[PDB]
Write a protein that holds these residues in place. Structure first.
Motif, PDB file in Angstrom:
ATOM      1  N   UNK A 100       2.155  -5.604   2.347  1.00 19.59           N
ATOM      2  CA  UNK A 100       1.910  -4.280   2.935  1.00 19.59           C
ATOM      3  C   UNK A 100       0.947  -4.417   4.138  1.00 19.59           C
ATOM      4  N   UNK A 110       8.628  -5.350  -1.859  1.00 20.94           N
ATOM      5  CA  UNK A 110       9.516  -4.241  -1.381  1.00 20.94           C
ATOM      6  C   UNK A 110      10.853  -4.752  -0.977  1.00 20.94           C
ATOM      7  N   UNK A 140       9.156  -5.930  -6.685  1.00 21.76           N
ATOM      8  CA  UNK A 140       8.175  -4.851  -6.558  1.00 21.76           C
ATOM      9  C   UNK A 140       7.137  -5.152  -5.515  1.00 21.76           C
ATOM     10  N   UNK A 144       1.021  -0.122  -4.950  1.00 19.37           N
ATOM     11  CA  UNK A 144       1.634  -1.222  -5.751  1.00 19.37           C
ATOM     12  C   UNK A 144       0.582  -2.273  -6.072  1.00 19.37           C
ATOM     13  N   UNK A 145      -0.252  -2.636  -5.117  1.00 19.16           N
ATOM     14  CA  UNK A 145      -1.375  -3.538  -5.368  1.00 19.16           C
ATOM     15  C   UNK A 145      -2.291  -2.987  -6.463  1.00 19.16           C
ATOM     16  N   UNK A 170      -0.289  -9.270  -7.287  1.00 16.32           N
ATOM     17  CA  UNK A 170      -1.169  -8.407  -6.533  1.00 16.32           C
ATOM     18  C   UNK A 170      -1.538  -8.979  -5.176  1.00 16.32           C
ATOM     19  N   UNK A 203     -13.046  -4.121  -6.762  1.00 21.61           N
ATOM     20  CA  UNK A 203     -11.991  -4.005  -5.788  1.00 21.61           C
ATOM     21  C   UNK A 203     -11.275  -2.661  -5.836  1.00 21.61           C
ATOM     22  N   UNK A 206       0.106 -11.508 -12.902  1.00 31.65           N
ATOM     23  CA  UNK A 206      -0.188 -10.233 -12.258  1.00 31.65           C
ATOM     24  C   UNK A 206      -1.098 -10.351 -11.038  1.00 31.65           C
ATOM     25  N   UNK A 237      -1.678  -0.805  -8.845  1.00 36.66           N
ATOM     26  CA  UNK A 237      -1.043  -0.912 -10.100  1.00 36.66           C
ATOM     27  C   UNK A 237      -1.198  -2.291 -10.699  1.00 36.66           C
ATOM     28  N   UNK A 238      -0.848  -3.330  -9.915  1.00 35.23           N
ATOM     29  CA  UNK A 238      -0.922  -4.672 -10.428  1.00 35.23           C
ATOM     30  C   UNK A 238      -2.297  -5.099 -10.802  1.00 35.23           C
ATOM     31  N   UNK A 239      -3.335  -4.628 -10.097  1.00 35.87           N
ATOM     32  CA  UNK A 239      -4.693  -4.949 -10.484  1.00 35.87           C
ATOM     33  C   UNK A 239      -5.216  -4.180 -11.721  1.00 35.87           C
ATOM     34  N   UNK A 295       1.540  -8.449  -2.990  1.00 33.29           N
ATOM     35  CA  UNK A 295       1.704  -7.049  -2.629  1.00 33.29           C
ATOM     36  C   UNK A 295       0.798  -6.716  -1.463  1.00 33.29           C
ATOM     37  N   UNK A 296      -0.452  -7.151  -1.537  1.00 32.15           N
ATOM     38  CA  UNK A 296      -1.445  -6.856  -0.468  1.00 32.15           C
ATOM     39  C   UNK A 296      -1.023  -7.466   0.859  1.00 32.15           C
ATOM     40  N   UNK A 320     -12.033  -0.568  -2.337  1.00 31.53           N
ATOM     41  CA  UNK A 320     -11.151  -1.028  -1.269  1.00 31.53           C
ATOM     42  C   UNK A 320     -10.047  -0.085  -1.122  1.00 31.53           C
ATOM     43  N   UNK A 321      -9.536   0.000   0.115  1.00 27.03           N
ATOM     44  CA  UNK A 321      -8.385   0.803   0.405  1.00 27.03           C
ATOM     45  C   UNK A 321      -7.227  -0.069  -0.101  1.00 27.03           C
ATOM     46  N   UNK A 322      -6.540   0.412  -1.131  1.00 27.71           N
ATOM     47  CA  UNK A 322      -5.363  -0.355  -1.599  1.00 27.71           C
ATOM     48  C   UNK A 322      -4.137   0.470  -1.498  1.00 27.71           C
ATOM     49  N   UNK A 323      -3.026  -0.232  -1.222  1.00 27.77           N
ATOM     50  CA  UNK A 323      -1.759   0.400  -1.435  1.00 27.77           C
ATOM     51  C   UNK A 323      -1.432   0.627  -2.955  1.00 27.77           C
TER      52      UNK A 323
END
Ligand SMILES: Nc1ncnc2c1ncn2[C@@H]1O[C@H](COP(=O)(O)OP(=O)(O)CP(=O)(O)O)[C@@H](O)[C@H]1O
Ligand SMILES: Nc1ncnc2c1ncn2[C@@H]1O[C@H](COP(=O)(O)OP(=O)(O)CP(=O)(O)O)[C@@H](O)[C@H]1O
Ligand SMILES: Cc1cn([C@H]2C[C@H](O)[C@@H](COP(=O)(O)O)O2)c(=O)[nH]c1=O
Ligand SMILES: Cc1cn([C@H]2C[C@H](O)[C@@H](COP(=O)(O)O)O2)c(=O)[nH]c1=O
Ligand SMILES: [Cl-]
Ligand SMILES: [Mg+2]
Ligand SMILES: [Mg+2]
Ligand SMILES: [Mg+2]
Ligand SMILES: [Mg+2]
Lengths: 194, 195
Positions: free
Chosen positions: B73, B119, B116, A58-59, B66, A49, B62, A61-63, B69-70, A53-56
């Motif tokens: 956004x 947002x 986080x 924050x996502x 995640x 992933x 986590x 980071x968490x992954x 978060x996805x 994948x195009x991730x933002x």
């Protein structure tokens, strides 16, 4: 005995960590070698992933942290319990340098996420392979989405700030050929390990 | 307008959220409906990991975050910009109740991660579908790893404490018949949205 390799893409971490792995096994240590992200079934799904994948930010980071958490629970803590030397190809400083110094997320927050995923497990030594970005990029073939000059200059600087500020980080000049670098790693390692 | 449904497994969240989607569409709203975890392609792969794998609680937290978060956004913030009413089948209170009250992770940390991932996006209203555990579990045909009496009794209690501590949570008695529970939802919603 937990040994971490850090540094920007093309510093030669993977090459150097596999060399050290086989060298310690030779010398009669029991050794493990894991990559981050990855190193577990779940972590390798997350790695895919992260790479595809195009991730933002924050996502992403968490992954990275989820991969680490799984690797710590499943592999690292049990290995250390068994007196295995554990070598990591990237660890916590990569997340600070890439997602923090590179992408602009708060470094102090990343530190707390790192401690959460690691349960406070810290390396005995971190080998920061430092290299100018232009040199490193010239070693690579295909560029992943992190392997761009503007971005990696920030990352290189962040690793060097961490080496000043974090504990047990040794700066290795990684710009030399494979064996000269390997000898510099062994000299640094003799500081914690026979 | 962001509406979250919360509550233990078998409270009827998914059933009620889809009723609400259909109701608001008939009233001429543009409406989105997403589940957590999931709701995006990435999120749905995380959802599969979360349901199928034995994970330690930290990795689980986590991955829940995640997925959130996805979704935030990719879907929720763009939808709010377009004046879509966004209905969520679970959101941030689930993570506090499950990973905090249920699994024992630190609630303040969970809240910090929630902020986080979101947002700072917060619901206008959260419908807590409250129901006794034994009733809820009897509605379910197959049990996932969370759908355990011991665990869910902790979680039910955590939701009810959150409904006091947090902002804009309304406790709905979800033990009734589907249409009845829906009517009580609409009455609660009328506080914040034209129904
Ligand atoms: N000292 C050195 N001089 C020249 N080329 C080297 C080198 N060390 C490694 N290489 C070559 O550079 C390329 C990248 O090496 P490697 O895969 O070890 O780097 P790395 O792990 O830092 C990249 P990444 O961070 O993206 O995983 C490989 O072709 C490798 O053979
Ligand atoms: N008010 C009600 N009375 C009786 N049965 C109901 C009910 N509402 C829903 N059900 C039925 O209970 C089952 C679970 O419903 P639903 O899927 O909506 O709950 P849920 O989303 O809370 C479970 P989970 O939290 O695990 O996703 C379904 O068979 C559903 O038709
Ligand atoms: C471990 C880690 C890697 N990365 C990046 C660096 C690499 O370009 C990519 C894959 O790294 P790898 O191939 O060294 O495992 O992931 C981060 O951005 N943050 C992290 O926390
Ligand atoms: C969103 C969320 C769900 N869950 C659990 C509750 C459910 O048993 C499971 C699947 O949820 P779902 O089918 O309601 O989307 O995930 C958590 O533990 N923490 C969370 O943050
Ligand atoms: Cl750290
Ligand atoms: Mg590598
Ligand atoms: Mg440079
Ligand atoms: Mg449901
Ligand atoms: Mg509308």
């Amino acid at each position: 005995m937990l040994i971490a390799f850090e540094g920007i893409d093309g510093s030669g971490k993977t090459t150097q960590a596999k060399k050290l792995y086989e060298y310690l096994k030779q010398k009669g240590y029991f050794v493990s070698l894991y990559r981050e992200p990855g190193g577990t079934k779940v972590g390798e799904v997350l790695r895919e992933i992260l790479l595809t994948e195009e991730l933002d930010e924050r996502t992403e980071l968490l992954l990275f942290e989820a991969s680490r958490s799984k690797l710590i629970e499943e592999k690292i803590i049990p290995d250390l319990k068994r007196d295995k030397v554990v070598i990591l190809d990237r660890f916590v400083l990569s997340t600070i340098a890439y997602q923090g110094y590179g992408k602009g997320l708060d470094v102090e927050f990343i530190k707390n996420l790192n401690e959460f995923a690691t349960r406070g497990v810290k390396p005995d030594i971190t080998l920061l392979l430092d290299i100018p970005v232009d040199i490193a990029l010239r070693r690579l073939k295909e560029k992943n989405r992190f392997e761009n000059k503007e971005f990696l200059e920030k990352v290189r600087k962040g690793f060097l700030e961490l080496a000043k500020e974090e504990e047990n980080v040794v700066v290795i000049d990684a710009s030399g050929e494979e064996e000269e670098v390997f000898k510099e790693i062994l000299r640094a390692l003799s500081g914690v390990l026979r």
